PDB file of all heavy atoms in Angstrom:
ATOM      1  N   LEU A   1     100.530 113.530 106.547  1.00  0.00           N
ATOM      2  CA  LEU A   1     100.849 112.322 107.299  1.00  0.00           C
ATOM      3  C   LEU A   1      99.552 111.619 107.716  1.00  0.00           C
ATOM      4  O   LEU A   1      99.472 110.387 107.667  1.00  0.00           O
ATOM      5  CB  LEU A   1     101.655 112.664 108.562  1.00  0.00           C
ATOM      6  CG  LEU A   1     103.061 113.208 108.399  1.00  0.00           C
ATOM      7  CD1 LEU A   1     103.839 112.938 109.671  1.00  0.00           C
ATOM      8  CD2 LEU A   1     103.765 112.591 107.202  1.00  0.00           C
ATOM      9  N   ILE A   2      98.561 112.396 108.181  1.00  0.00           N
ATOM     10  CA  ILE A   2      97.363 111.826 108.766  1.00  0.00           C
ATOM     11  C   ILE A   2      96.669 110.970 107.724  1.00  0.00           C
ATOM     12  O   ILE A   2      96.169 109.899 108.065  1.00  0.00           O
ATOM     13  CB  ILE A   2      96.444 112.895 109.368  1.00  0.00           C
ATOM     14  CG1 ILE A   2      96.852 113.126 110.833  1.00  0.00           C
ATOM     15  CG2 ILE A   2      94.979 112.494 109.237  1.00  0.00           C
ATOM     16  CD1 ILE A   2      96.321 114.402 111.464  1.00  0.00           C
ATOM     17  N   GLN A   3      96.597 111.451 106.481  1.00  0.00           N
ATOM     18  CA  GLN A   3      96.002 110.656 105.415  1.00  0.00           C
ATOM     19  C   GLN A   3      96.793 109.362 105.215  1.00  0.00           C
ATOM     20  O   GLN A   3      96.192 108.305 105.042  1.00  0.00           O
ATOM     21  CB  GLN A   3      95.900 111.438 104.118  1.00  0.00           C
ATOM     22  CG  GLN A   3      95.581 110.534 102.944  1.00  0.00           C
ATOM     23  CD  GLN A   3      96.811 109.850 102.388  1.00  0.00           C
ATOM     24  OE1 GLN A   3      97.949 110.208 102.691  1.00  0.00           O
ATOM     25  NE2 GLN A   3      96.597 108.865 101.527  1.00  0.00           N
ATOM     26  N   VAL A   4      98.129 109.444 105.270  1.00  0.00           N
ATOM     27  CA  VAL A   4      98.988 108.293 105.058  1.00  0.00           C
ATOM     28  C   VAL A   4      98.782 107.274 106.168  1.00  0.00           C
ATOM     29  O   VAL A   4      98.352 106.152 105.930  1.00  0.00           O
ATOM     30  CB  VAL A   4     100.475 108.678 104.962  1.00  0.00           C
ATOM     31  CG1 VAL A   4     101.424 107.507 105.197  1.00  0.00           C
ATOM     32  CG2 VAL A   4     100.759 109.344 103.624  1.00  0.00           C
ATOM     33  N   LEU A   5      99.169 107.632 107.386  1.00  0.00           N
ATOM     34  CA  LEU A   5      99.077 106.701 108.496  1.00  0.00           C
ATOM     35  C   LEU A   5      97.730 105.989 108.489  1.00  0.00           C
ATOM     36  O   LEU A   5      97.666 104.791 108.753  1.00  0.00           O
ATOM     37  CB  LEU A   5      99.274 107.440 109.819  1.00  0.00           C
ATOM     38  CG  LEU A   5     100.678 107.971 110.106  1.00  0.00           C
ATOM     39  CD1 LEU A   5     101.037 107.750 111.574  1.00  0.00           C
ATOM     40  CD2 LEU A   5     101.758 107.366 109.218  1.00  0.00           C
ATOM     41  N   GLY A   6      96.684 106.710 108.055  1.00  0.00           N
ATOM     42  CA  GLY A   6      95.374 106.111 107.857  1.00  0.00           C
ATOM     43  C   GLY A   6      95.486 104.864 106.988  1.00  0.00           C
ATOM     44  O   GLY A   6      95.386 103.750 107.485  1.00  0.00           O
ATOM     45  N   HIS A   7      95.841 105.063 105.721  1.00  0.00           N
ATOM     46  CA  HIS A   7      96.034 103.978 104.770  1.00  0.00           C
ATOM     47  C   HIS A   7      97.522 103.614 104.673  1.00  0.00           C
ATOM     48  O   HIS A   7      98.190 103.998 103.707  1.00  0.00           O
ATOM     49  CB  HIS A   7      95.481 104.402 103.402  1.00  0.00           C
ATOM     50  CG  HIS A   7      94.402 103.521 102.861  1.00  0.00           C
ATOM     51  ND1 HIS A   7      94.362 103.103 101.550  1.00  0.00           N
ATOM     52  CD2 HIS A   7      93.312 103.009 103.450  1.00  0.00           C
ATOM     53  CE1 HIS A   7      93.294 102.342 101.370  1.00  0.00           C
ATOM     54  NE2 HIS A   7      92.642 102.271 102.510  1.00  0.00           N
ATOM     55  N   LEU A   8      98.029 102.877 105.675  1.00  0.00           N
ATOM     56  CA  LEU A   8      99.446 102.529 105.703  1.00  0.00           C
ATOM     57  C   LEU A   8      99.849 101.637 104.524  1.00  0.00           C
ATOM     58  O   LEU A   8     100.897 101.852 103.917  1.00  0.00           O
ATOM     59  CB  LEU A   8      99.764 101.883 107.047  1.00  0.00           C
ATOM     60  CG  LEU A   8     101.242 101.718 107.392  1.00  0.00           C
ATOM     61  CD1 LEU A   8     102.088 102.876 106.869  1.00  0.00           C
ATOM     62  CD2 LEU A   8     101.425 101.560 108.894  1.00  0.00           C
ATOM     63  N   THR A   9      98.986 100.678 104.156  1.00  0.00           N
ATOM     64  CA  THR A   9      99.170  99.860 102.959  1.00  0.00           C
ATOM     65  C   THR A   9     100.540  99.179 102.900  1.00  0.00           C
ATOM     66  O   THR A   9     100.983  98.594 103.880  1.00  0.00           O
ATOM     67  CB  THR A   9      98.919 100.699 101.703  1.00  0.00           C
ATOM     68  OG1 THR A   9     100.049 101.545 101.475  1.00  0.00           O
ATOM     69  CG2 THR A   9      97.649 101.507 101.819  1.00  0.00           C
ATOM     70  N   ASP A  10     101.203  99.214 101.737  1.00  0.00           N
ATOM     71  CA  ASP A  10     102.438  98.484 101.486  1.00  0.00           C
ATOM     72  C   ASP A  10     103.581  98.980 102.379  1.00  0.00           C
ATOM     73  O   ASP A  10     103.650 100.172 102.681  1.00  0.00           O
ATOM     74  CB  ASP A  10     102.787  98.614 100.001  1.00  0.00           C
ATOM     75  CG  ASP A  10     104.017  97.825  99.569  1.00  0.00           C
ATOM     76  OD1 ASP A  10     105.116  98.189 100.000  1.00  0.00           O
ATOM     77  OD2 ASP A  10     103.853  96.845  98.814  1.00  0.00           O
ATOM     78  N   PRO A  11     104.461  98.077 102.884  1.00  0.00           N
ATOM     79  CA  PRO A  11     105.597  98.462 103.722  1.00  0.00           C
ATOM     80  C   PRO A  11     106.865  98.880 102.976  1.00  0.00           C
ATOM     81  O   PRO A  11     107.793  99.365 103.608  1.00  0.00           O
ATOM     82  CB  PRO A  11     105.900  97.159 104.489  1.00  0.00           C
ATOM     83  CG  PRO A  11     105.598  96.105 103.457  1.00  0.00           C
ATOM     84  CD  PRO A  11     104.398  96.618 102.683  1.00  0.00           C
ATOM     85  N   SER A  12     106.935  98.613 101.664  1.00  0.00           N
ATOM     86  CA  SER A  12     108.079  99.047 100.878  1.00  0.00           C
ATOM     87  C   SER A  12     107.881 100.481 100.383  1.00  0.00           C
ATOM     88  O   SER A  12     108.838 101.094  99.907  1.00  0.00           O
ATOM     89  CB  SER A  12     108.372  98.095  99.730  1.00  0.00           C
ATOM     90  OG  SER A  12     108.235  98.761  98.484  1.00  0.00           O
ATOM     91  N   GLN A  13     106.642 100.991 100.392  1.00  0.00           N
ATOM     92  CA  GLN A  13     106.347 102.293  99.812  1.00  0.00           C
ATOM     93  C   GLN A  13     106.004 103.337 100.879  1.00  0.00           C
ATOM     94  O   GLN A  13     105.503 104.407 100.533  1.00  0.00           O
ATOM     95  CB  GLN A  13     105.187 102.190  98.820  1.00  0.00           C
ATOM     96  CG  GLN A  13     105.528 101.367  97.591  1.00  0.00           C
ATOM     97  CD  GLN A  13     104.618 101.673  96.420  1.00  0.00           C
ATOM     98  OE1 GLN A  13     103.465 102.089  96.555  1.00  0.00           O
ATOM     99  NE2 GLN A  13     105.143 101.445  95.231  1.00  0.00           N
ATOM    100  N   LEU A  14     106.314 103.069 102.151  1.00  0.00           N
ATOM    101  CA  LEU A  14     106.056 104.040 103.207  1.00  0.00           C
ATOM    102  C   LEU A  14     106.885 105.303 102.981  1.00  0.00           C
ATOM    103  O   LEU A  14     106.369 106.420 103.082  1.00  0.00           O
ATOM    104  CB  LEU A  14     106.351 103.434 104.583  1.00  0.00           C
ATOM    105  CG  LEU A  14     105.825 104.240 105.775  1.00  0.00           C
ATOM    106  CD1 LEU A  14     104.470 104.866 105.460  1.00  0.00           C
ATOM    107  CD2 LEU A  14     105.709 103.378 107.008  1.00  0.00           C
ATOM    108  N   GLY A  15     108.169 105.122 102.667  1.00  0.00           N
ATOM    109  CA  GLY A  15     109.093 106.229 102.492  1.00  0.00           C
ATOM    110  C   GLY A  15     108.617 107.283 101.496  1.00  0.00           C
ATOM    111  O   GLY A  15     108.499 108.448 101.851  1.00  0.00           O
ATOM    112  N   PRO A  16     108.317 106.916 100.234  1.00  0.00           N
ATOM    113  CA  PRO A  16     107.890 107.894  99.231  1.00  0.00           C
ATOM    114  C   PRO A  16     106.683 108.706  99.681  1.00  0.00           C
ATOM    115  O   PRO A  16     106.637 109.911  99.459  1.00  0.00           O
ATOM    116  CB  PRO A  16     107.531 107.065  98.001  1.00  0.00           C
ATOM    117  CG  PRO A  16     108.294 105.757  98.214  1.00  0.00           C
ATOM    118  CD  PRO A  16     108.337 105.541  99.721  1.00  0.00           C
ATOM    119  N   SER A  17     105.729 108.055 100.355  1.00  0.00           N
ATOM    120  CA  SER A  17     104.473 108.689 100.727  1.00  0.00           C
ATOM    121  C   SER A  17     104.654 109.745 101.820  1.00  0.00           C
ATOM    122  O   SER A  17     104.106 110.840 101.716  1.00  0.00           O
ATOM    123  CB  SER A  17     103.448 107.665 101.138  1.00  0.00           C
ATOM    124  OG  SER A  17     103.353 106.613 100.188  1.00  0.00           O
ATOM    125  N   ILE A  18     105.426 109.430 102.855  1.00  0.00           N
ATOM    126  CA  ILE A  18     105.739 110.421 103.875  1.00  0.00           C
ATOM    127  C   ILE A  18     106.643 111.521 103.312  1.00  0.00           C
ATOM    128  O   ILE A  18     106.530 112.678 103.725  1.00  0.00           O
ATOM    129  CB  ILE A  18     106.346 109.782 105.132  1.00  0.00           C
ATOM    130  CG1 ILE A  18     107.329 108.665 104.772  1.00  0.00           C
ATOM    131  CG2 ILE A  18     105.235 109.342 106.069  1.00  0.00           C
ATOM    132  CD1 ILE A  18     108.768 109.101 104.746  1.00  0.00           C
ATOM    133  N   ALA A  19     107.514 111.179 102.359  1.00  0.00           N
ATOM    134  CA  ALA A  19     108.395 112.152 101.739  1.00  0.00           C
ATOM    135  C   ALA A  19     107.616 113.303 101.105  1.00  0.00           C
ATOM    136  O   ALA A  19     107.943 114.464 101.329  1.00  0.00           O
ATOM    137  CB  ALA A  19     109.280 111.503 100.723  1.00  0.00           C
ATOM    138  N   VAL A  20     106.567 112.974 100.351  1.00  0.00           N
ATOM    139  CA  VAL A  20     105.750 113.974  99.695  1.00  0.00           C
ATOM    140  C   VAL A  20     105.106 114.900 100.733  1.00  0.00           C
ATOM    141  O   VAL A  20     104.927 116.089 100.467  1.00  0.00           O
ATOM    142  CB  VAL A  20     104.688 113.321  98.790  1.00  0.00           C
ATOM    143  CG1 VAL A  20     103.283 113.375  99.397  1.00  0.00           C
ATOM    144  CG2 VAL A  20     104.718 113.954  97.407  1.00  0.00           C
ATOM    145  N   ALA A  21     104.720 114.360 101.891  1.00  0.00           N
ATOM    146  CA  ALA A  21     104.052 115.166 102.891  1.00  0.00           C
ATOM    147  C   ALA A  21     104.921 116.329 103.350  1.00  0.00           C
ATOM    148  O   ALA A  21     104.397 117.328 103.836  1.00  0.00           O
ATOM    149  CB  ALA A  21     103.679 114.322 104.074  1.00  0.00           C
ATOM    150  N   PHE A  22     106.246 116.173 103.256  1.00  0.00           N
ATOM    151  CA  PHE A  22     107.170 117.205 103.685  1.00  0.00           C
ATOM    152  C   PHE A  22     107.393 118.254 102.600  1.00  0.00           C
ATOM    153  O   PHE A  22     107.944 119.310 102.886  1.00  0.00           O
ATOM    154  CB  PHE A  22     108.487 116.588 104.184  1.00  0.00           C
ATOM    155  CG  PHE A  22     108.422 116.242 105.652  1.00  0.00           C
ATOM    156  CD1 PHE A  22     107.765 115.099 106.072  1.00  0.00           C
ATOM    157  CD2 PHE A  22     108.885 117.127 106.615  1.00  0.00           C
ATOM    158  CE1 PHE A  22     107.630 114.812 107.415  1.00  0.00           C
ATOM    159  CE2 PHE A  22     108.737 116.853 107.961  1.00  0.00           C
ATOM    160  CZ  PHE A  22     108.150 115.674 108.357  1.00  0.00           C
ATOM    161  N   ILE A  23     106.913 118.020 101.377  1.00  0.00           N
ATOM    162  CA  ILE A  23     106.913 119.054 100.356  1.00  0.00           C
ATOM    163  C   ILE A  23     106.156 120.281 100.839  1.00  0.00           C
ATOM    164  O   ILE A  23     106.572 121.417 100.586  1.00  0.00           O
ATOM    165  CB  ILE A  23     106.360 118.558  99.017  1.00  0.00           C
ATOM    166  CG1 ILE A  23     107.433 117.795  98.235  1.00  0.00           C
ATOM    167  CG2 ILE A  23     105.847 119.736  98.205  1.00  0.00           C
ATOM    168  CD1 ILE A  23     108.613 118.660  97.825  1.00  0.00           C
ATOM    169  N   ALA A  24     105.055 120.052 101.552  1.00  0.00           N
ATOM    170  CA  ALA A  24     104.322 121.175 102.097  1.00  0.00           C
ATOM    171  C   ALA A  24     105.208 122.052 102.969  1.00  0.00           C
ATOM    172  O   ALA A  24     105.465 123.173 102.566  1.00  0.00           O
ATOM    173  CB  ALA A  24     103.123 120.695 102.829  1.00  0.00           C
ATOM    174  N   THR A  25     105.780 121.545 104.068  1.00  0.00           N
ATOM    175  CA  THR A  25     106.525 122.452 104.931  1.00  0.00           C
ATOM    176  C   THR A  25     107.524 123.259 104.107  1.00  0.00           C
ATOM    177  O   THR A  25     107.716 124.450 104.397  1.00  0.00           O
ATOM    178  CB  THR A  25     107.243 121.792 106.111  1.00  0.00           C
ATOM    179  OG1 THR A  25     108.059 122.776 106.759  1.00  0.00           O
ATOM    180  CG2 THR A  25     108.140 120.648 105.696  1.00  0.00           C
ATOM    181  N   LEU A  26     108.022 122.685 103.004  1.00  0.00           N
ATOM    182  CA  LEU A  26     108.942 123.410 102.155  1.00  0.00           C
ATOM    183  C   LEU A  26     108.271 124.642 101.560  1.00  0.00           C
ATOM    184  O   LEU A  26     108.879 125.707 101.595  1.00  0.00           O
ATOM    185  CB  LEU A  26     109.484 122.490 101.064  1.00  0.00           C
ATOM    186  CG  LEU A  26     110.432 123.161 100.074  1.00  0.00           C
ATOM    187  CD1 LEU A  26     111.604 123.816 100.794  1.00  0.00           C
ATOM    188  CD2 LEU A  26     110.951 122.149  99.068  1.00  0.00           C
ATOM    189  N   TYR A  27     107.033 124.552 101.060  1.00  0.00           N
ATOM    190  CA  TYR A  27     106.383 125.735 100.490  1.00  0.00           C
ATOM    191  C   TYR A  27     106.097 126.812 101.540  1.00  0.00           C
ATOM    192  O   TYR A  27     106.188 128.008 101.263  1.00  0.00           O
ATOM    193  CB  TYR A  27     105.078 125.419  99.764  1.00  0.00           C
ATOM    194  CG  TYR A  27     105.173 124.515  98.563  1.00  0.00           C
ATOM    195  CD1 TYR A  27     104.023 123.959  98.031  1.00  0.00           C
ATOM    196  CD2 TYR A  27     106.373 124.175  97.975  1.00  0.00           C
ATOM    197  CE1 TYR A  27     104.050 123.087  96.961  1.00  0.00           C
ATOM    198  CE2 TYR A  27     106.428 123.323  96.891  1.00  0.00           C
ATOM    199  CZ  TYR A  27     105.266 122.763  96.389  1.00  0.00           C
ATOM    200  OH  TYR A  27     105.331 121.914  95.317  1.00  0.00           O
ATOM    201  N   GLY A  28     105.753 126.394 102.753  1.00  0.00           N
ATOM    202  CA  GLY A  28     105.527 127.350 103.814  1.00  0.00           C
ATOM    203  C   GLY A  28     106.769 128.192 104.130  1.00  0.00           C
ATOM    204  O   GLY A  28     106.724 129.412 104.114  1.00  0.00           O
ATOM    205  N   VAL A  29     107.911 127.543 104.375  1.00  0.00           N
ATOM    206  CA  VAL A  29     109.107 128.247 104.783  1.00  0.00           C
ATOM    207  C   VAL A  29     109.727 128.959 103.603  1.00  0.00           C
ATOM    208  O   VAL A  29     110.203 130.069 103.766  1.00  0.00           O
ATOM    209  CB  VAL A  29     110.106 127.309 105.454  1.00  0.00           C
ATOM    210  CG1 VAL A  29     111.406 128.011 105.794  1.00  0.00           C
ATOM    211  CG2 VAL A  29     109.465 126.722 106.701  1.00  0.00           C
ATOM    212  N   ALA A  30     109.710 128.359 102.426  1.00  0.00           N
ATOM    213  CA  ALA A  30     110.335 128.977 101.266  1.00  0.00           C
ATOM    214  C   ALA A  30     109.629 130.260 100.847  1.00  0.00           C
ATOM    215  O   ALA A  30     110.298 131.246 100.528  1.00  0.00           O
ATOM    216  CB  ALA A  30     110.383 128.014 100.110  1.00  0.00           C
ATOM    217  N   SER A  31     108.288 130.225 100.800  1.00  0.00           N
ATOM    218  CA  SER A  31     107.526 131.388 100.387  1.00  0.00           C
ATOM    219  C   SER A  31     107.677 132.514 101.389  1.00  0.00           C
ATOM    220  O   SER A  31     107.849 133.645 100.997  1.00  0.00           O
ATOM    221  CB  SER A  31     106.073 131.082 100.120  1.00  0.00           C
ATOM    222  OG  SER A  31     105.416 130.588 101.248  1.00  0.00           O
ATOM    223  N   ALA A  32     107.633 132.217 102.676  1.00  0.00           N
ATOM    224  CA  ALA A  32     107.729 133.274 103.662  1.00  0.00           C
ATOM    225  C   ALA A  32     109.105 133.916 103.673  1.00  0.00           C
ATOM    226  O   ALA A  32     109.177 135.097 103.944  1.00  0.00           O
ATOM    227  CB  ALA A  32     107.339 132.785 105.015  1.00  0.00           C
ATOM    228  N   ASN A  33     110.199 133.173 103.495  1.00  0.00           N
ATOM    229  CA  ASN A  33     111.533 133.727 103.688  1.00  0.00           C
ATOM    230  C   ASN A  33     112.238 134.122 102.390  1.00  0.00           C
ATOM    231  O   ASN A  33     113.440 134.375 102.413  1.00  0.00           O
ATOM    232  CB  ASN A  33     112.421 132.766 104.492  1.00  0.00           C
ATOM    233  CG  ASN A  33     111.977 132.726 105.936  1.00  0.00           C
ATOM    234  OD1 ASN A  33     112.690 133.204 106.810  1.00  0.00           O
ATOM    235  ND2 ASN A  33     110.762 132.260 106.184  1.00  0.00           N
TER     236      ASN A  33
END
């Protein structure tokens, strides 16, 4: 997120960029459990 909010850029493409950031939390919880 921090990298994103930094370069907010286009307003139509905010969704995809924050979406990818949540891929991480998925690897953390999936691998552990």
Side-chain angles (χ1 to χ4, degrees):
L1 293 203
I2 271 164
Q3 167 278 346
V4 161
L5 290 221
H7 239 224
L8 193 35
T9 76
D10 184 292
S12 118
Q13 294 201 333
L14 193 37
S17 311
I18 40 96
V20 105
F22 272 78
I23 279 296
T25 173
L26 178 56
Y27 298 166
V29 176
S31 61
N33 289 249

